[PDB]
Amino acid sequence: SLVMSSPALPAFLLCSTLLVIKMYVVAIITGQVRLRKKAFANPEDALRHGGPQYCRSDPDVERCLRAHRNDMETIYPFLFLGFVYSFLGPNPFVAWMHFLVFLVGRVAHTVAYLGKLRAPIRSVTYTLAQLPCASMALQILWEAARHL
Amino acid sequence: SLVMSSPALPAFLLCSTLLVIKMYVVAIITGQVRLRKKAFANPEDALRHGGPQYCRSDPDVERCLRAHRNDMETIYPFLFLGFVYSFLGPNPFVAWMHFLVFLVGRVAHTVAYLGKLRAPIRSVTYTLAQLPCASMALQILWEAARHL
Amino acid sequence: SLVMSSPALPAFLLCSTLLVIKMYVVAIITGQVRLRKKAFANPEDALRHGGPQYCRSDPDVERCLRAHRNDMETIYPFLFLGFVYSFLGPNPFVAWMHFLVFLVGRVAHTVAYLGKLRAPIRSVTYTLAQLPCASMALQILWEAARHL
Numbered sequence: 269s270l271v272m273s274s275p276a277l278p279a280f281l282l283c284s285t286l287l288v289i290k291m292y293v294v295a296i297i298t299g300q301v302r303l304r305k306k307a308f309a310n311p312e313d314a315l316r317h318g319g320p321q322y323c324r325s326d327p328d329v330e331r332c333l334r335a336h337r338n339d340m341e342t343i344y345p346f347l348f349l350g351f352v353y354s355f356l357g358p359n360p361f362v363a364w365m366h367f368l369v370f371l372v373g374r375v376a377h378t379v380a381y382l383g384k385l386r387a388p389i390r391s392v393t394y395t396l397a398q399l400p401c402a403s404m405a406l407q408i409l410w411e412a413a414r415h416l
Numbered sequence: 417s418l419v420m421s422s423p424a425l426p427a428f429l430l431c432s433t434l435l436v437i438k439m440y441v442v443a444i445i446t447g448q449v450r451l452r453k454k455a456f457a458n459p460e461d462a463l464r465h466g467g468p469q470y471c472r473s474d475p476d477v478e479r480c481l482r483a484h485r486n487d488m489e490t491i492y493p494f495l496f497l498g499f500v501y502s503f504l505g506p507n508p509f510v511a512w513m514h515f516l517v518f519l520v521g522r523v524a525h526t527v528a529y530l531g532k533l534r535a536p537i538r539s540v541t542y543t544l545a546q547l548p549c550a551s552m553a554l555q556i557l558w559e560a561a562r563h564l
Numbered sequence: 565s566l567v568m569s570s571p572a573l574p575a576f577l578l579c580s581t582l583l584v585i586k587m588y589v590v591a592i593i594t595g596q597v598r599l600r601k602k603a604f605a606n607p608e609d610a611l612r613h614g615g616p617q618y619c620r621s622d623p624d625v626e627r628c629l630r631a632h633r634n635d636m637e638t639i640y641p642f643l644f645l646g647f648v649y650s651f652l653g654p655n656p657f658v659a660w661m662h663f664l665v666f667l668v669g670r671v672a673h674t675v676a677y678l679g680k681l682r683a684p685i686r687s688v689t690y691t692l693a694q695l696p697c698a699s700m701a702l703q704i705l706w707e708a709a710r711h712l
């Protein structure tokens with residue numbers, strides 16, 4: 269299979285796809301919270317679910333949206349960087365570690381965010397996960413620059 | 417051409433690029449609504465377009481931003497998943513159907529959102545489009561896992 | 565290296581990775597502004613940094629978030645379009661120009677946004693950067709369609 273175009277690719281695809289699914293889980297949770305708290309973003313939604321007064325903001329809904337937004341700010345760049353990095357012939361174990369640190373850091377981030385864990389737990393998980401991203405970004409820069 | 421690296425790739429690239437253009441259309445509409453409703457996000461914009469009182473929120477602008485955000489939550493993962501999935505040798509017709517259901521579902525979503533269609537029309541289109549994404553995500557998981 | 569799979573790829577990877585790093589810079593700035601202005605999005609953050617009254621919005625924080633969001637609306641599609649476009653055998657110099665115009669336009673956009681430059685400076689930089697994206701999108705459409 270084309271999944272074996274590089275030794276690091278399967279690990280990357282496993283971690284990335286799990287993270288995409290993790291984002292879908294955040295979307296599902298957001299919808300559930302909207303229904304439970306009766307806090308809808310649109311009048312058409314509110315009118316179907318009890319009346320116009322339910323078109324309103326809710327702190328738990330806003331928190332879910334923040335977690336999802338932070339995912340978009342971090343996981344989407346990883347999908348790009350990790351894919352490219354997989355083809356630069358990195359040491360297989362080193363590549364694994366980059367992907368695993370990102371996966372664990374990001375899952376922990378969502379748990380810390382939605383679970384309202386004390387500071388600086390969420391911030392630490394964010395920083396931890398950004399480290400392999402910074403590392404991959406620099407490696408790609410060098411490889412790209414040297415092939416110009 | 418490298419567009420023929422896999423039988424499903426041309427269909428994927430057609431649908432994905434149309435969806436990117438569809439997002440650009442949402443951005444264009446957002447700008448048009450800001451100008452028509454005189455609702456700008458920045459004081460520098462407002463001062464150029466009639467005065468400081470026009471740095472303000474507007475429900476139609478907010479709706480446009482929600483549609484665009486929902487696109488980012490769904491179309492961006494599809495760009496990743498669909499690209500990878502194209503290289504897993506899926507049945508050409510089955511792959512076509514995954515891409516077409518996503519394309520139709522997402523175009524319908526934007527129409528339902530910006531057109532303020534009654535509930536649950538928008539929600540149904542969202543769910544419909546997520547189905548092929550879930551399907552592709554699971555298929556990638558199995559392929560990645562089995563190549564570890 | 566696989567970075568040489570197409571003549572335009574190294575230039576694309578250089579520009580894209582610089583833009584990802586530029587987004588990370590926006591994230592770093594956002595955090596710094598939150599701390600300086602004592603404007604946190606979460607009560608757990610606020611309580612660690614001086615008290616519950618510091619869970620509040622701030623116009624400079626909101627501006628940073630807008631810049632980051634606009635980046636997600638524009639740079640993420642470029643990561644997709646530019647990657648695909650690199651493999652369509654475009655003229656090397658023409659491809660370079662597409663990538664450079666996007667890079668310069670987007671860096672200028674962030675400077676214009678965060679620097680609060682007068683209108684329509686930011687809007688012009690946005691439009692300039694979208695031009696090569698529109699161009700690449702259409703080229704991909706034709707290539708994909710003709711391979712169906």
Ligand SMILES: CC(C)Oc1ccc(-n2c(C(=O)O)cc3cc(-c4ccc(C(C)(C)C)cc4)ccc32)cc1
Pocket residue numbers: 387388391392393395396595596598599604609612
């Ligand atoms: C609310 C936002 C805008 O402001 C702040 C957020 C968090 C923090 N904050 C604190 C603190 O005392 O609150 C400690 C702390 C520690 C790390 C860290 C992470 C990874 C490492 C490794 C070992 C993985 C390199 C080492 C340290 C990151 C952030 C940290 C400070 C300000």
Ligand SMILES: CC(C)Oc1ccc(-n2c(C(=O)O)cc3cc(-c4ccc(C(C)(C)C)cc4)ccc32)cc1
Pocket residue numbers: 299300302303308313316535536539540541543544
């Ligand atoms: C506002 C948000 C937070 O809350 C809700 C939103 C929508 C819904 N909602 C309703 C309802 O009665 O309002 C019916 C309904 C039906 C589907 C659906 C979609 C695809 C299928 C196929 C056939 C494609 C599998 C089957 C059913 C999805 C959502 C649906 C309920 C709650």
Ligand SMILES: CC(C)Oc1ccc(-n2c(C(=O)O)cc3cc(-c4ccc(C(C)(C)C)cc4)ccc32)cc1
Pocket residue numbers: 447448450451456461464683684687688689691692
């Ligand atoms: C706040 C938002 C919602 O509304 C507006 C924002 C900006 C503008 N605005 C104005 C104006 O007078 O304010 C001039 C202007 C000029 C260009 C442009 C860009 C690139 C080119 C090239 C040469 C690169 C093709 C040519 C012209 C774009 C936008 C422009 C108008 C409305």
Ligand SMILES: CCCCCCCCO[C@@H]1O[C@H](CO)[C@@H](O)[C@H](O)[C@H]1O
Pocket residue numbers: 290293294378379382383384
């Ligand atoms: C990938 C999805 C991860 C979901 C993690 C949800 C963690 C929720 O965890 C819950 O958080 C509540 C506050 O929100 C607390 O009151 C509960 O003690 C805690 O169990």
Ligand SMILES: CCCCCCCCO[C@@H]1O[C@H](CO)[C@@H](O)[C@H](O)[C@H]1O
Pocket residue numbers: 438441442526527530531532
């Ligand atoms: C890809 C871009 C799709 C744009 C779809 C725009 C649909 C707008 O549709 C309009 O919506 C208005 C309410 O907003 C209604 O008053 C009008 O009856 C309806 O024509």
Ligand SMILES: CCCCCCCCO[C@@H]1O[C@H](CO)[C@@H](O)[C@H](O)[C@H]1O
Pocket residue numbers: 586589590674675678679680
């Ligand atoms: C990639 C990151 C780009 C950061 C660009 C930051 C530009 C900040 O620039 C500053 O903006 C202030 C208003 O915000 C002005 O008061 C200052 O005159 C100006 O120096």
Ligand SMILES: N[C@@H](CCC(=O)N[C@@H](CS)C(=O)NCC(=O)O)C(=O)O
Pocket residue numbers: 334335337338341390391394395590591592594595605629632
């Ligand atoms: N957009 C982010 C930029 C910086 C960032 O990502 N910070 C991390 C660590 S404090 C975070 O978890 N932010 C919470 C969030 O984005 O809602 C923000 O506003 O905080």
Ligand SMILES: N[C@@H](CCC(=O)N[C@@H](CS)C(=O)NCC(=O)O)C(=O)O
Pocket residue numbers: 294295296298299309333336482483485486489538539542543
């Ligand atoms: N971020 C979404 C997560 C769930 C979701 O995507 N729901 C669909 C179906 S109800 C939707 O169209 N949401 C509207 C939106 O995202 O603004 C939300 O807040 O609703």
Ligand SMILES: N[C@@H](CCC(=O)N[C@@H](CS)C(=O)NCC(=O)O)C(=O)O
Pocket residue numbers: 442443444446447457481484630631633634637686687690691
């Ligand atoms: N989401 C954008 C859509 C249109 C757009 O991207 N406009 C450009 C040029 S005016 C911009 O810089 N918008 C500022 C922003 O997105 O915050 C908006 O709300 O303005």
